[PDB]
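Work package 3, deliverable 3.1, input record:
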Amino acid sequence: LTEEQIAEFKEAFSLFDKDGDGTITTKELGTVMRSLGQNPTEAELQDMINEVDADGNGTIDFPEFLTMMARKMKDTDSEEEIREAFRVFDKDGNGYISAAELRHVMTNLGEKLTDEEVDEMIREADIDGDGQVNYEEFVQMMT
Amino acid sequence: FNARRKLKGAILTTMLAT
Ligand SMILES: [Ca+2]
Ligand SMILES: [Ca+2]
Ligand SMILES: [Ca+2]
Ligand SMILES: [Ca+2]
Ligand SMILES: [Ca+2]
C-alpha cells in the first residue's frame, strides 16, 4: 500500500463510524448499507464483521478495516462494482453526476460540506471539463 | 478537508455497501 491508498481508507472508515468511538459494528454496517437502499440480513452482516474481527470485543477498529481492504474475501456473481456504485450516485440515470447530486449523496452519508467543497470534488473527477462527472471518468478515478 | 479523498472515501464506502 501507499500514503494515498491508506488515506482513502481512513475516510471510508469515518462514514460507518457514526457514534464516534473509532469502531464499526454489524449495526453500523447494516444501517449505512440500508441508507444506500441495500438490505442486509443479520447472518450475512455477521459473515462480514466477525470475519475481520480479531482481539475479541465485537467491533472493527481502523487496523482491522485496513487489513480487510487488502486481504479481502473473493466474489460470487459480481463483476461490475464500479457501475453499481456509479448508479447509486447518478440519481437520474442520464449518466452524469451533477454537483447537485453529489451533495445529495454526501448529506445522506452524513457529510455537511461547503458548496466550494462540493464543486472542488466534481472538479477533481471531471476529466473533460464539462462541469459534471460521467461514468468513463468515475471508472478512471477509481482505476 | 481534502476534496479528492472525500470523494474517493465515499466511492469506496458505496462499493463496500454494494
Ligand atoms: Ca462507531
Ligand atoms: Ca475487533
Ligand atoms: Ca444524473
Ligand atoms: Ca455535461
Ligand atoms: Ca466530466
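The first helix of chain B runs from residue 3 to 16.
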